Amino acid sequence: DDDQVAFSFILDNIVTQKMMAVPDSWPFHHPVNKKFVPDYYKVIVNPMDLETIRKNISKHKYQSRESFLDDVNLILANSVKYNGPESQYTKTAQEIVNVCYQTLTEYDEHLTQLEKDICTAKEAALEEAE
Amino acid sequence: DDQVAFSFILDNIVTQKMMAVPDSWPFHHPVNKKFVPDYYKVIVNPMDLETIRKNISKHKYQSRESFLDDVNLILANSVKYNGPESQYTKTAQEIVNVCYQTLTEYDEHLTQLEKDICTAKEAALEEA
Amino acid sequence: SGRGKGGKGLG
């Protein structure tokens, strides 16, 4: 569906062109491998990385900036919890989240309009299903 | 060119095969001192797969042997820095392994191209 | 913090 596809399209370009382009951000492009960091999942409850966000976008998980940002926010919060607040990992994670937020403000009004249209479409489907 | 097709083939080994080794991502780009501060103290002749791709894009490699020297240096470097028994060195060894296998699946083509890159050098010298 | 992922990301 048209508006949801357009909305996912934009989120995906934010991930690929901006978030993944943060210098030295490579370790956040991949899930942490529990064989090599055996305590990571003792500490981190809800893992996330940039390749998983891309997979979620391709399946239209996100109908709104808010559910996209809940997964982006985990990138920072997990790094703080596992790698520590003054770790170079965490400095890189903050940059990843900062570019995402700054990019999304450039597209504010258009993403507001696409969210409204996704919701109007959805509503039309439900009342229409009766 | 023999060189354009040769470089194409090497780049596809790096991206398709060597970068596909599981958990090989730490070898895909140069180490940053900000993450590994003693790394360039220990490793005086650094190498990574992105660097090999830039080398290929500049046609630095005229033969498999010059290409393999850089590939092998990735393993020689992991040996010194991470240690001979390190998990990272087992991956580096696997990257080295899949490079050698893929070169074989392309032997005849690469030989043709490698011969023709010389023919050009001698045409140059004969004309010089 | 946990035990740490080391400088290179895989321990």
PDB file of C-alpha atoms in Angstrom:
ATOM      1  CA  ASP A   1       0.000   0.000   0.000  1.00  0.00           C
ATOM      2  CA  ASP A   2       1.052   3.374  -1.293  1.00  0.00           C
ATOM      3  CA  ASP A   3       1.572   5.556   1.743  1.00  0.00           C
ATOM      4  CA  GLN A   4       3.041   2.847   3.961  1.00  0.00           C
ATOM      5  CA  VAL A   5       5.519   1.945   1.171  1.00  0.00           C
ATOM      6  CA  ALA A   6       6.514   5.575   0.798  1.00  0.00           C
ATOM      7  CA  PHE A   7       6.885   5.952   4.572  1.00  0.00           C
ATOM      8  CA  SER A   8       9.079   2.775   4.835  1.00  0.00           C
ATOM      9  CA  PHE A   9      11.120   3.975   1.880  1.00  0.00           C
ATOM     10  CA  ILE A  10      12.128   7.131   3.659  1.00  0.00           C
ATOM     11  CA  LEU A  11      12.945   5.337   6.980  1.00  0.00           C
ATOM     12  CA  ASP A  12      15.153   2.928   5.038  1.00  0.00           C
ATOM     13  CA  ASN A  13      17.144   5.744   3.451  1.00  0.00           C
ATOM     14  CA  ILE A  14      17.661   7.300   6.848  1.00  0.00           C
ATOM     15  CA  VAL A  15      19.120   4.032   8.071  1.00  0.00           C
ATOM     16  CA  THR A  16      21.313   3.426   5.008  1.00  0.00           C
ATOM     17  CA  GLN A  17      22.459   6.910   4.102  1.00  0.00           C
ATOM     18  CA  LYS A  18      22.698   8.518   7.451  1.00  0.00           C
ATOM     19  CA  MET A  19      22.803   6.151  10.405  1.00  0.00           C
ATOM     20  CA  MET A  20      24.998   3.464   8.789  1.00  0.00           C
ATOM     21  CA  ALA A  21      27.314   6.279   7.428  1.00  0.00           C
ATOM     22  CA  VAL A  22      28.276   7.419  10.961  1.00  0.00           C
ATOM     23  CA  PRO A  23      32.057   6.917  11.124  1.00  0.00           C
ATOM     24  CA  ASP A  24      33.119   3.683  12.814  1.00  0.00           C
ATOM     25  CA  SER A  25      29.541   2.613  13.333  1.00  0.00           C
ATOM     26  CA  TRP A  26      30.173  -0.990  11.934  1.00  0.00           C
ATOM     27  CA  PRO A  27      29.644  -2.821  15.193  1.00  0.00           C
ATOM     28  CA  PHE A  28      26.000  -1.518  15.347  1.00  0.00           C
ATOM     29  CA  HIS A  29      25.306  -2.823  11.820  1.00  0.00           C
ATOM     30  CA  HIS A  30      25.392  -6.413  13.122  1.00  0.00           C
ATOM     31  CA  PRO A  31      23.696  -8.411  15.981  1.00  0.00           C
ATOM     32  CA  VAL A  32      26.114  -9.048  18.842  1.00  0.00           C
ATOM     33  CA  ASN A  33      27.311 -12.707  18.644  1.00  0.00           C
ATOM     34  CA  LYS A  34      26.624 -14.352  21.908  1.00  0.00           C
ATOM     35  CA  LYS A  35      29.365 -17.022  21.398  1.00  0.00           C
ATOM     36  CA  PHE A  36      31.920 -14.193  21.465  1.00  0.00           C
ATOM     37  CA  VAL A  37      30.386 -11.817  24.079  1.00  0.00           C
ATOM     38  CA  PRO A  38      28.855 -14.445  26.369  1.00  0.00           C
ATOM     39  CA  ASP A  39      27.333 -12.011  28.857  1.00  0.00           C
ATOM     40  CA  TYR A  40      25.727  -9.620  26.348  1.00  0.00           C
ATOM     41  CA  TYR A  41      22.265 -11.239  26.599  1.00  0.00           C
ATOM     42  CA  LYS A  42      22.485 -11.639  30.391  1.00  0.00           C
ATOM     43  CA  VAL A  43      22.567  -7.842  30.425  1.00  0.00           C
ATOM     44  CA  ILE A  44      20.529  -6.760  27.294  1.00  0.00           C
ATOM     45  CA  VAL A  45      16.834  -7.797  27.220  1.00  0.00           C
ATOM     46  CA  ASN A  46      15.716  -6.282  23.882  1.00  0.00           C
ATOM     47  CA  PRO A  47      18.623  -6.323  21.416  1.00  0.00           C
ATOM     48  CA  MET A  48      18.669  -4.151  18.336  1.00  0.00           C
ATOM     49  CA  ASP A  49      21.076  -3.278  15.492  1.00  0.00           C
ATOM     50  CA  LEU A  50      20.822  -1.426  12.184  1.00  0.00           C
ATOM     51  CA  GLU A  51      20.467  -4.559  10.035  1.00  0.00           C
ATOM     52  CA  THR A  52      17.432  -5.663  12.188  1.00  0.00           C
ATOM     53  CA  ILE A  53      15.850  -2.143  11.860  1.00  0.00           C
ATOM     54  CA  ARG A  54      16.225  -2.513   8.042  1.00  0.00           C
ATOM     55  CA  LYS A  55      14.502  -5.904   8.150  1.00  0.00           C
ATOM     56  CA  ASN A  56      11.685  -4.439  10.265  1.00  0.00           C
ATOM     57  CA  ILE A  57      11.225  -1.543   7.742  1.00  0.00           C
ATOM     58  CA  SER A  58      11.116  -3.919   4.814  1.00  0.00           C
ATOM     59  CA  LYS A  59       8.178  -5.765   6.514  1.00  0.00           C
ATOM     60  CA  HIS A  60       6.421  -2.467   7.304  1.00  0.00           C
ATOM     61  CA  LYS A  61       6.709  -2.870  11.003  1.00  0.00           C
ATOM     62  CA  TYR A  62       6.530   0.892  11.543  1.00  0.00           C
ATOM     63  CA  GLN A  63       3.391   2.976  10.824  1.00  0.00           C
ATOM     64  CA  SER A  64       4.771   5.982  12.625  1.00  0.00           C
ATOM     65  CA  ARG A  65       7.923   7.743  13.670  1.00  0.00           C
ATOM     66  CA  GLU A  66       7.218   6.841  17.237  1.00  0.00           C
ATOM     67  CA  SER A  67       7.445   2.959  16.734  1.00  0.00           C
ATOM     68  CA  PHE A  68      10.542   3.423  14.517  1.00  0.00           C
ATOM     69  CA  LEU A  69      12.147   5.568  17.205  1.00  0.00           C
ATOM     70  CA  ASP A  70      11.446   3.047  19.942  1.00  0.00           C
ATOM     71  CA  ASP A  71      13.801   0.596  18.088  1.00  0.00           C
ATOM     72  CA  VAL A  72      16.352   3.338  17.281  1.00  0.00           C
ATOM     73  CA  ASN A  73      16.321   4.442  21.011  1.00  0.00           C
ATOM     74  CA  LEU A  74      17.414   0.827  21.973  1.00  0.00           C
ATOM     75  CA  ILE A  75      20.650   1.310  20.059  1.00  0.00           C
ATOM     76  CA  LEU A  76      21.693   4.028  22.591  1.00  0.00           C
ATOM     77  CA  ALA A  77      20.096   2.512  25.723  1.00  0.00           C
ATOM     78  CA  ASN A  78      21.632  -0.954  25.086  1.00  0.00           C
ATOM     79  CA  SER A  79      25.075   0.520  24.543  1.00  0.00           C
ATOM     80  CA  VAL A  80      24.874   2.623  27.742  1.00  0.00           C
ATOM     81  CA  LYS A  81      23.819  -0.503  29.731  1.00  0.00           C
ATOM     82  CA  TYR A  82      26.332  -2.954  28.229  1.00  0.00           C
ATOM     83  CA  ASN A  83      29.297  -0.920  27.068  1.00  0.00           C
ATOM     84  CA  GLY A  84      28.940   1.891  29.706  1.00  0.00           C
ATOM     85  CA  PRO A  85      28.144   5.559  29.371  1.00  0.00           C
ATOM     86  CA  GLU A  86      31.683   6.762  28.615  1.00  0.00           C
ATOM     87  CA  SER A  87      32.642   3.909  26.227  1.00  0.00           C
ATOM     88  CA  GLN A  88      33.611   4.805  22.676  1.00  0.00           C
ATOM     89  CA  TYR A  89      30.751   2.416  21.567  1.00  0.00           C
ATOM     90  CA  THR A  90      28.257   4.605  23.353  1.00  0.00           C
ATOM     91  CA  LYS A  91      29.676   7.769  21.884  1.00  0.00           C
ATOM     92  CA  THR A  92      29.172   6.159  18.461  1.00  0.00           C
ATOM     93  CA  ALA A  93      25.646   5.005  19.349  1.00  0.00           C
ATOM     94  CA  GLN A  94      24.646   8.545  20.432  1.00  0.00           C
ATOM     95  CA  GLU A  95      25.846   9.845  17.057  1.00  0.00           C
ATOM     96  CA  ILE A  96      23.760   7.155  15.321  1.00  0.00           C
ATOM     97  CA  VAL A  97      20.659   8.268  17.276  1.00  0.00           C
ATOM     98  CA  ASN A  98      21.458  11.998  16.850  1.00  0.00           C
ATOM     99  CA  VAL A  99      21.673  11.791  13.030  1.00  0.00           C
ATOM    100  CA  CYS A 100      18.438   9.806  12.946  1.00  0.00           C
ATOM    101  CA  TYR A 101      16.589  12.539  14.947  1.00  0.00           C
ATOM    102  CA  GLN A 102      18.117  15.369  12.955  1.00  0.00           C
ATOM    103  CA  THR A 103      17.335  13.683   9.669  1.00  0.00           C
ATOM    104  CA  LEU A 104      13.691  13.061  10.704  1.00  0.00           C
ATOM    105  CA  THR A 105      13.204  16.798  11.455  1.00  0.00           C
ATOM    106  CA  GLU A 106      14.002  17.587   7.821  1.00  0.00           C
ATOM    107  CA  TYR A 107      11.117  15.375   6.776  1.00  0.00           C
ATOM    108  CA  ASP A 108       8.800  16.389   9.659  1.00  0.00           C
ATOM    109  CA  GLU A 109       5.770  17.685   7.775  1.00  0.00           C
ATOM    110  CA  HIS A 110       5.892  15.116   5.056  1.00  0.00           C
ATOM    111  CA  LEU A 111       6.208  12.203   7.539  1.00  0.00           C
ATOM    112  CA  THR A 112       3.310  13.734   9.520  1.00  0.00           C
ATOM    113  CA  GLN A 113       1.220  13.687   6.375  1.00  0.00           C
ATOM    114  CA  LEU A 114       2.228  10.109   5.471  1.00  0.00           C
ATOM    115  CA  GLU A 115       1.389   8.915   9.000  1.00  0.00           C
ATOM    116  CA  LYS A 116      -2.043  10.562   8.795  1.00  0.00           C
ATOM    117  CA  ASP A 117      -2.657   8.958   5.413  1.00  0.00           C
ATOM    118  CA  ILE A 118      -1.550   5.454   6.618  1.00  0.00           C
ATOM    119  CA  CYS A 119      -4.042   5.841   9.458  1.00  0.00           C
ATOM    120  CA  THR A 120      -6.873   7.118   7.169  1.00  0.00           C
ATOM    121  CA  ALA A 121      -6.254   4.145   4.818  1.00  0.00           C
ATOM    122  CA  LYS A 122      -6.268   1.736   7.794  1.00  0.00           C
ATOM    123  CA  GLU A 123      -9.569   3.245   9.165  1.00  0.00           C
ATOM    124  CA  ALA A 124     -11.179   3.033   5.695  1.00  0.00           C
ATOM    125  CA  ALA A 125     -10.230  -0.679   5.670  1.00  0.00           C
ATOM    126  CA  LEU A 126     -11.812  -1.389   9.121  1.00  0.00           C
ATOM    127  CA  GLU A 127     -15.174   0.419   8.811  1.00  0.00           C
ATOM    128  CA  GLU A 128     -15.212  -0.917   5.235  1.00  0.00           C
ATOM    129  CA  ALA A 129     -14.810  -4.444   6.682  1.00  0.00           C
ATOM    130  CA  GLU A 130     -18.518  -4.081   7.864  1.00  0.00           C
TER     131      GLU A 130
ATOM    132  CA  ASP B   1      41.346  -4.473 -20.843  1.00  0.00           C
ATOM    133  CA  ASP B   2      42.657  -7.664 -19.340  1.00  0.00           C
ATOM    134  CA  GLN B   3      43.361  -5.372 -16.352  1.00  0.00           C
ATOM    135  CA  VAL B   4      39.652  -4.063 -16.158  1.00  0.00           C
ATOM    136  CA  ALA B   5      38.303  -7.696 -16.231  1.00  0.00           C
ATOM    137  CA  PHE B   6      41.062  -8.917 -13.856  1.00  0.00           C
ATOM    138  CA  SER B   7      40.299  -6.183 -11.260  1.00  0.00           C
ATOM    139  CA  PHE B   8      36.517  -6.919 -11.656  1.00  0.00           C
ATOM    140  CA  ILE B   9      37.139 -10.564 -10.787  1.00  0.00           C
ATOM    141  CA  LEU B  10      39.320  -9.765  -7.756  1.00  0.00           C
ATOM    142  CA  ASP B  11      36.773  -7.274  -6.443  1.00  0.00           C
ATOM    143  CA  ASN B  12      34.027  -9.899  -6.681  1.00  0.00           C
ATOM    144  CA  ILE B  13      36.199 -12.397  -4.698  1.00  0.00           C
ATOM    145  CA  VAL B  14      36.594  -9.766  -1.905  1.00  0.00           C
ATOM    146  CA  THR B  15      32.910  -8.750  -1.789  1.00  0.00           C
ATOM    147  CA  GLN B  16      31.097 -11.941  -2.681  1.00  0.00           C
ATOM    148  CA  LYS B  17      33.364 -14.473  -0.916  1.00  0.00           C
ATOM    149  CA  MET B  18      35.810 -13.011   1.544  1.00  0.00           C
ATOM    150  CA  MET B  19      33.389 -10.486   3.075  1.00  0.00           C
ATOM    151  CA  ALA B  20      30.771 -13.292   3.295  1.00  0.00           C
ATOM    152  CA  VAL B  21      32.927 -15.241   5.899  1.00  0.00           C
ATOM    153  CA  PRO B  22      30.776 -15.326   9.119  1.00  0.00           C
ATOM    154  CA  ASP B  23      31.938 -12.737  11.794  1.00  0.00           C
ATOM    155  CA  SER B  24      34.524 -11.325   9.318  1.00  0.00           C
ATOM    156  CA  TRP B  25      33.281  -7.745   9.619  1.00  0.00           C
ATOM    157  CA  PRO B  26      36.113  -6.532  11.951  1.00  0.00           C
ATOM    158  CA  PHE B  27      38.469  -7.224   8.952  1.00  0.00           C
ATOM    159  CA  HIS B  28      36.338  -5.280   6.460  1.00  0.00           C
ATOM    160  CA  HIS B  29      37.682  -1.803   7.368  1.00  0.00           C
ATOM    161  CA  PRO B  30      40.881  -0.264   8.826  1.00  0.00           C
ATOM    162  CA  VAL B  31      41.100  -0.400  12.616  1.00  0.00           C
ATOM    163  CA  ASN B  32      40.462   2.919  14.337  1.00  0.00           C
ATOM    164  CA  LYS B  33      42.854   3.873  17.108  1.00  0.00           C
ATOM    165  CA  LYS B  34      39.833   5.261  19.049  1.00  0.00           C
ATOM    166  CA  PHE B  35      38.528   1.682  19.539  1.00  0.00           C
ATOM    167  CA  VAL B  36      41.961  -0.167  19.580  1.00  0.00           C
ATOM    168  CA  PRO B  37      44.624   2.203  20.846  1.00  0.00           C
ATOM    169  CA  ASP B  38      47.700  -0.089  20.791  1.00  0.00           C
ATOM    170  CA  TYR B  39      46.878  -1.555  17.404  1.00  0.00           C
ATOM    171  CA  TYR B  40      49.318   0.536  15.241  1.00  0.00           C
ATOM    172  CA  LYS B  41      51.994   0.168  17.884  1.00  0.00           C
ATOM    173  CA  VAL B  42      51.896  -3.598  17.300  1.00  0.00           C
ATOM    174  CA  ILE B  43      50.966  -3.777  13.575  1.00  0.00           C
ATOM    175  CA  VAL B  44      53.492  -1.760  11.468  1.00  0.00           C
ATOM    176  CA  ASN B  45      52.130  -2.911   8.090  1.00  0.00           C
ATOM    177  CA  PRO B  46      48.287  -2.788   8.425  1.00  0.00           C
ATOM    178  CA  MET B  47      45.790  -4.200   5.942  1.00  0.00           C
ATOM    179  CA  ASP B  48      42.009  -4.738   5.729  1.00  0.00           C
ATOM    180  CA  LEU B  49      39.538  -5.682   2.965  1.00  0.00           C
ATOM    181  CA  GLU B  50      38.338  -2.184   2.232  1.00  0.00           C
ATOM    182  CA  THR B  51      41.954  -1.156   1.611  1.00  0.00           C
ATOM    183  CA  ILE B  52      42.302  -4.190  -0.818  1.00  0.00           C
ATOM    184  CA  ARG B  53      39.120  -2.949  -2.650  1.00  0.00           C
ATOM    185  CA  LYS B  54      40.595   0.566  -3.061  1.00  0.00           C
ATOM    186  CA  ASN B  55      43.823  -1.027  -4.310  1.00  0.00           C
ATOM    187  CA  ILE B  56      41.800  -3.033  -6.810  1.00  0.00           C
ATOM    188  CA  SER B  57      39.872   0.036  -7.916  1.00  0.00           C
ATOM    189  CA  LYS B  58      43.298   1.649  -8.725  1.00  0.00           C
ATOM    190  CA  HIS B  59      44.425  -1.551 -10.556  1.00  0.00           C
ATOM    191  CA  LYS B  60      47.302  -1.947  -8.108  1.00  0.00           C
ATOM    192  CA  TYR B  61      47.279  -5.741  -8.665  1.00  0.00           C
ATOM    193  CA  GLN B  62      48.618  -7.182 -11.950  1.00  0.00           C
ATOM    194  CA  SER B  63      48.803 -10.755 -10.781  1.00  0.00           C
ATOM    195  CA  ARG B  64      47.216 -13.068  -8.222  1.00  0.00           C
ATOM    196  CA  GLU B  65      50.507 -13.071  -6.346  1.00  0.00           C
ATOM    197  CA  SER B  66      50.479  -9.338  -5.560  1.00  0.00           C
ATOM    198  CA  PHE B  67      46.835  -9.633  -4.474  1.00  0.00           C
ATOM    199  CA  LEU B  68      47.574 -12.652  -2.267  1.00  0.00           C
ATOM    200  CA  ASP B  69      50.460 -10.878  -0.533  1.00  0.00           C
ATOM    201  CA  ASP B  70      47.938  -8.310   0.832  1.00  0.00           C
ATOM    202  CA  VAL B  71      45.365 -10.978   1.664  1.00  0.00           C
ATOM    203  CA  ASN B  72      48.008 -13.031   3.509  1.00  0.00           C
ATOM    204  CA  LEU B  73      49.134  -9.963   5.416  1.00  0.00           C
ATOM    205  CA  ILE B  74      45.622  -9.806   6.989  1.00  0.00           C
ATOM    206  CA  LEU B  75      46.263 -13.243   8.501  1.00  0.00           C
ATOM    207  CA  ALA B  76      49.957 -12.478   9.394  1.00  0.00           C
ATOM    208  CA  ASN B  77      48.618  -9.295  11.176  1.00  0.00           C
ATOM    209  CA  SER B  78      45.867 -11.121  13.133  1.00  0.00           C
ATOM    210  CA  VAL B  79      48.522 -13.659  14.244  1.00  0.00           C
ATOM    211  CA  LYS B  80      50.651 -10.857  15.772  1.00  0.00           C
ATOM    212  CA  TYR B  81      47.929  -8.712  17.126  1.00  0.00           C
ATOM    213  CA  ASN B  82      45.210 -11.150  18.216  1.00  0.00           C
ATOM    214  CA  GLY B  83      47.473 -14.243  18.547  1.00  0.00           C
ATOM    215  CA  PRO B  84      47.818 -17.547  16.646  1.00  0.00           C
ATOM    216  CA  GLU B  85      44.900 -19.244  18.525  1.00  0.00           C
ATOM    217  CA  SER B  86      42.491 -16.257  18.643  1.00  0.00           C
ATOM    218  CA  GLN B  87      39.021 -16.557  17.355  1.00  0.00           C
ATOM    219  CA  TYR B  88      39.770 -13.475  15.130  1.00  0.00           C
ATOM    220  CA  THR B  89      42.758 -15.435  13.644  1.00  0.00           C
ATOM    221  CA  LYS B  90      40.538 -18.393  12.872  1.00  0.00           C
ATOM    222  CA  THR B  91      38.250 -16.081  10.890  1.00  0.00           C
ATOM    223  CA  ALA B  92      41.245 -14.402   9.175  1.00  0.00           C
ATOM    224  CA  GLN B  93      42.440 -17.913   8.203  1.00  0.00           C
ATOM    225  CA  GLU B  94      38.985 -18.640   6.762  1.00  0.00           C
ATOM    226  CA  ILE B  95      39.082 -15.355   4.721  1.00  0.00           C
ATOM    227  CA  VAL B  96      42.515 -16.503   3.425  1.00  0.00           C
ATOM    228  CA  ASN B  97      41.059 -19.977   2.650  1.00  0.00           C
ATOM    229  CA  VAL B  98      38.032 -18.782   0.590  1.00  0.00           C
ATOM    230  CA  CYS B  99      40.284 -16.350  -1.333  1.00  0.00           C
ATOM    231  CA  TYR B 100      42.569 -19.277  -2.381  1.00  0.00           C
ATOM    232  CA  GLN B 101      39.577 -21.496  -3.383  1.00  0.00           C
ATOM    233  CA  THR B 102      37.886 -18.849  -5.450  1.00  0.00           C
ATOM    234  CA  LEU B 103      41.118 -18.056  -7.329  1.00  0.00           C
ATOM    235  CA  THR B 104      41.048 -21.730  -8.458  1.00  0.00           C
ATOM    236  CA  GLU B 105      37.467 -21.589  -9.794  1.00  0.00           C
ATOM    237  CA  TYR B 106      38.789 -18.727 -11.915  1.00  0.00           C
ATOM    238  CA  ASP B 107      42.351 -19.998 -12.716  1.00  0.00           C
ATOM    239  CA  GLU B 108      42.089 -20.245 -16.529  1.00  0.00           C
ATOM    240  CA  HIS B 109      40.375 -16.888 -16.999  1.00  0.00           C
ATOM    241  CA  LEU B 110      42.831 -15.185 -14.590  1.00  0.00           C
ATOM    242  CA  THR B 111      45.833 -16.736 -16.406  1.00  0.00           C
ATOM    243  CA  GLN B 112      44.577 -15.378 -19.756  1.00  0.00           C
ATOM    244  CA  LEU B 113      44.176 -11.939 -18.202  1.00  0.00           C
ATOM    245  CA  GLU B 114      47.545 -12.226 -16.363  1.00  0.00           C
ATOM    246  CA  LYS B 115      49.354 -13.122 -19.662  1.00  0.00           C
ATOM    247  CA  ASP B 116      47.723 -10.222 -21.452  1.00  0.00           C
ATOM    248  CA  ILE B 117      48.728  -7.637 -18.799  1.00  0.00           C
ATOM    249  CA  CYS B 118      52.418  -8.636 -19.675  1.00  0.00           C
ATOM    250  CA  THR B 119      51.893  -8.579 -23.407  1.00  0.00           C
ATOM    251  CA  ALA B 120      50.872  -4.926 -22.862  1.00  0.00           C
ATOM    252  CA  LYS B 121      54.070  -4.118 -20.817  1.00  0.00           C
ATOM    253  CA  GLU B 122      56.329  -5.590 -23.642  1.00  0.00           C
ATOM    254  CA  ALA B 123      54.340  -3.717 -26.349  1.00  0.00           C
ATOM    255  CA  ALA B 124      55.138  -0.602 -24.257  1.00  0.00           C
ATOM    256  CA  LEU B 125      58.900  -1.533 -23.926  1.00  0.00           C
ATOM    257  CA  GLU B 126      59.155  -2.554 -27.630  1.00  0.00           C
ATOM    258  CA  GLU B 127      57.540   0.828 -28.498  1.00  0.00           C
ATOM    259  CA  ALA B 128      59.414   2.765 -25.645  1.00  0.00           C
TER     260      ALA B 128
ATOM    261  CA  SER C   1      28.528  -2.200  32.203  1.00  0.00           C
ATOM    262  CA  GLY C   2      29.078  -5.882  31.193  1.00  0.00           C
ATOM    263  CA  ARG C   3      32.432  -7.699  30.679  1.00  0.00           C
ATOM    264  CA  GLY C   4      33.000  -5.818  27.445  1.00  0.00           C
ATOM    265  CA  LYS C   5      33.062  -6.551  23.707  1.00  0.00           C
ATOM    266  CA  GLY C   6      36.779  -5.413  23.443  1.00  0.00           C
ATOM    267  CA  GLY C   7      38.041  -2.907  20.837  1.00  0.00           C
ATOM    268  CA  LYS C   8      37.226  -5.007  17.796  1.00  0.00           C
ATOM    269  CA  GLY C   9      33.665  -5.957  18.719  1.00  0.00           C
ATOM    270  CA  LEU C  10      33.726  -9.809  19.174  1.00  0.00           C
ATOM    271  CA  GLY C  11      35.419  -9.943  22.623  1.00  0.00           C
TER     272      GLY C  11
END
